[model samples]
Target: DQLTEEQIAEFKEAFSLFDKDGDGTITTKELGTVMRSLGQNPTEAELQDMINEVDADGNGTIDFPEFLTMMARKMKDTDSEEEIREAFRVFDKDGNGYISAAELRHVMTNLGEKLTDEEVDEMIREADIDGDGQVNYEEFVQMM
Candidate 1:
């Protein structure tokens, strides 16, 4: 609950993007559209998975507060902010606070492993917190 202003801003931005209608709620179609636009088109199963995780109301739509809470849960489940920031330092080879496919490949390769381009792409899709093709700082943080 000790969220910084910057953290709240990041969460709000992500939620707004998903709330395509500006109605402060995200319907399945809206979420699907947003995901597709981000180049991480989700399958029906994936969308359902997300809904199960965040749709507390069971109305098949995620509201702003629900989205915020879900993001907080994701952050908590994965890593603390400090840990995520450190991982970002390593993953973000360009120091731009964004993780591109090329950077991901380098990091993965340097970590003594390799991923096929297809696998790399899938990772991006799977780890994209905001469902955006390009992973921003917030998305990268959640990926940790």
Candidate 2:
């Protein structure tokens, strides 16, 4: 509960999107589809971790209340939104408002730490929150 009515409503909407079957709970399969649409390509194991992380009843699914708690926890975990957006702007080299896969790979490879192609792409996968093949400010902030 510390969430305002607006926040609660938003979460309700999101939960409905994930709970496609309207069963009042999000099963792993539905969770996978919703998450994939959001550009989150977590593996099955990672998917299990996601549900189990908030599965208070150990029912292998996320109910509305558990979903609220999960959202609250995630909101608390991140740094300031302002600062995160500032960092994202730096990564958005061309200022197209997003960091393309190529931009990420190029900067990563040219960095002093120099990563391989695989490593670079993995980083993209980690931050491409919308499956758009690019990292928007919101996605970049989440990655941080």
Candidate 3:
């Protein structure tokens, strides 16, 4: 999917919010908190499921590079860049250029769907760029 500059910016802002602790890496716990904050509490089992799907190394967590690759894969199957951007825009509620788990959940919920903890984990793995635990504007744009 080809995302416009605005859409990429929204993604970057959302990514930054999730990259808490300033460690440039998003752990399952961190992602979980983000989701909880948004009123979508997930169980440990759900979280673990998400991690297992993306943590190819079995390291029990997802890294930035792996995440970016994952996001690219999702975009690969999409046909409408406009729809993708619209969805991303909704996910980036504050327009701050990042997408926290909460924001992501909000978008999903609004679409009449709810993601499991595992699904959220997969999304993070798919979206995070720079392998720094967050998706910057450049990376967000590039992925599109």
Best by TM-score: 2
Winning candidate number (lDDT): 2
Q: How close is candidate 2 to the true structure, as a TM-score?
A: 0.43
Model 1, global lDDT: 0.63
Residue 124 CA error for candidate 1 (Å)? 33
Q: lDDT per residue, candidate 3, 24-67, as tens digits?
A: 66776565565454334367886666666776565445455554
TM-scores of all predicted structures: 0.41, 0.43, 0.34
TM-score of candidate 1 on Cα atoms, chains taken together: 0.41
Q: Which stretches of candidate 1 lie over 4 Å from their true place?
A: 29-47, 53-58, 80-144
Deviating ranges (above 4 Å) for candidate 2: 32-47, 54-58, 81-144
- Candidate 3: residue 126 lDDT (0-100): 75
Task: Select the stronger candidate by lDDT from 2 and 3.
Answer: 2
Candidate 1 residue-wise lDDT, 1-144, digit = tens:
556777677667776877767887778655655544422434788666777766655776677676656555544544467766785677566767766666665666566446576776676667643443456766555555
Please report, in order, the local distance difference test score of every candidate based on alpha carbons.
Answer: 0.63, 0.66, 0.55
* Model 3 Cα RMSD, 1 decimal: 17.7
Which of 2 and 3 is ahead in TM-score? 2
